[PDB]
Amino acid sequence: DLRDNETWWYNPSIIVHPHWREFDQVPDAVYYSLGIFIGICGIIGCGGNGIVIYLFTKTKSLQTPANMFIINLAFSDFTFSLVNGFPLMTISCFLKKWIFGFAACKVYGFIGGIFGFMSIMTMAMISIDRYNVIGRPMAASKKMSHRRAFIMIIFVWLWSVLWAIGPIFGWGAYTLEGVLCNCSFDYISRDSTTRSNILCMFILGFFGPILIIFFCYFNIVMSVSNHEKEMAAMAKRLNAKELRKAQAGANAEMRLAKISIVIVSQFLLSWSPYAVVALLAQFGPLEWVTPYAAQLPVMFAKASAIHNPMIYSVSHPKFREAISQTFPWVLTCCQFDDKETEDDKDAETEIPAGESSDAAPSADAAQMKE
Ligand SMILES: *C/C=C(C)/C=C\C=C(C)\C=C\C1=C(C)CCCC1(C)C
Ligand SMILES: *C(=O)CCCCCCCCCCCCCCC
Ligand SMILES: *C(=O)CCCCCCCCCCCCCCC
Residue type, 263: I
| Number of neighbouring beta carbons within 10 Å of residue 275 | 18
Distance between Cα 134 and ligand 1 center (Å): 31
Q: How many domains does the chain have?
A: 1
Domain boundaries, position 346: 7-357
Q: Rounded CA gap, 22 and 9, in Å?
A: 10
For ligand 2, is residue 333 a contact (CB within 6 Å)?
yes
Distance between Cα 368 and ligand 1 center (Å): 41
For ligand 1, is residue 109 a contact (CB within 6 Å)?
yes
| Number of neighbouring beta carbons within 10 Å of residue 177 | 26
Query: Residue 41 gets which letter from DSSP?
Result: H
Q: Please give the full DSSP string across 74-140, using - where no structure is assigned.
A: HHHHHHHHHHHSTTHHHHHHHTTS--S-HHHHHHHHHHHHHHHHHHHHHHHHHHHHHIIIIIS-GGG
Beta bridge mates, 184: 175
Q: Is residue 2 part of a domain?
A: no
Distance between Cα 44 and ligand 2 center (Å): 10
* Specified resolution (Å): 3.7
From first CA to last CA, the distance across the chain in angstroms is: 73
Contact 54, 65 (CB under 8 A): no
The protein residue with its alpha carbon nearest to ligand 2, atom 2, reads: 333
* DSSP-H helix ranges across 207-330: 208-225, 227-233, 242-283, 291-303, 307-312, 317-326
For ligand 1, is residue 120 a contact (CB within 6 Å)?
no
- How many residues are given for the chain? 370
Maximum alpha-carbon separation in the chain: 94
The three-state secondary structure class of 233 is helix
Kindly report whether the peptide bond that precedes residue 87 is cis, defined as omega within 30 degrees of 0.
yes
Q: Which ligand approaches the C-alpha of residue 334 most closely?
A: 3
Q: Is residue 368 part of a domain?
A: no
Residue type, 181: C
Q: Please give the full DSSP string across 170-194, using - where no structure is assigned.
A: TSS-EEE-TTSSSEEE--S---HHH
Q: Is residue 134 part of a domain?
A: yes
Residue type, 266: Q
| Number of neighbouring beta carbons within 10 Å of residue 277 | 22
Residue type, 214: F
Q: Which ligand approaches the C-alpha of residue 306 most closely?
A: 3
The three-state secondary structure class of 142 is coil
Query: Residue 354 gets which letter from DSSP?
Result: S
Q: Is residue 362 part of a domain?
A: no
Q: Is residue 363 part of a domain?
A: no
Query: Residue 3 gets which letter from DSSP?
Result: S
Q: Rounded CA gap, 294 and 307, in Å?
A: 21
| Number of neighbouring beta carbons within 10 Å of residue 193 | 14
For ligand 2, is residue 329 a contact (CB within 6 Å)?
no
Q: Is residue 39 part of a domain?
A: yes
356, burial (CB in 10 Å: exposed 0-12, middle 13-18, buried 19+): exposed
Q: Rounded CA gap, 242 and 351, in Å?
A: 10
Backbone φ and ψ for 174, nearest 5 degrees, come out as -115, 130
Residue type, 174: Y
Chain Cα centroid distance, residue 88: 22
Distance between Cα 258 and ligand 1 center (Å): 26
Candidates 216, 253, 250; CA nearest to 230 is 250
What CATH code is carried by the domain that includes residue 42?
Answer: 1.20.1070.10
Contact 4, 20 (CB under 8 A): no
Contact 295, 154 (CB under 8 A): no
Q: Rounded CA gap, 211 and 205, in Å?
A: 11
Q: Which ligand approaches the C-alpha of residue 314 most closely?
A: 3
Which residues are within 8 A (CB) of 189 and not within 5 positions of it... i.e. 6 or more apart? 17, 173, 195
Chain Cα centroid distance, residue 218: 20
Candidates 121, 156, 149, 133; CA nearest to 256 is 133
Atom number of ligand 3 nearest to Cα 313: 3
Candidates 250, 260, 258; CA nearest to 346 is 250
Breaks in the chain (C to N over 2.5 Å), named by the residue before each, are none
Q: Rounded CA gap, 32 and 96, in Å?
A: 8
Distance between Cα 124 and ligand 2 center (Å): 32
Q: Is residue 365 part of a domain?
A: no
Candidates 181, 157, 20; CA nearest to 85 is 181
99, burial (CB in 10 Å: exposed 0-12, middle 13-18, buried 19+): middle
Chain Cα centroid distance, residue 247: 29
Q: Rounded CA gap, 33 and 94, in Å?
A: 9
Q: Is residue 153 part of a domain?
A: yes
Report the C-alpha dihedral over residues 19, 24, 29, 30, rounded to 10 degrees: -30
Q: Rounded CA gap, 184 and 107, in Å?
A: 9
Substitution candidate for ligand 1 out of 76, 82, 117, 160 with most atoms within 8 A of CB? 117
For ligand 1, is residue 275 a contact (CB within 6 Å)?
yes
Residue type, 32: Y
Q: Rounded CA gap, 57 and 106, in Å?
A: 32
With residue 234 as reference, give the H or E element that holds it: none
Distance between Cα 164 and ligand 1 center (Å): 9
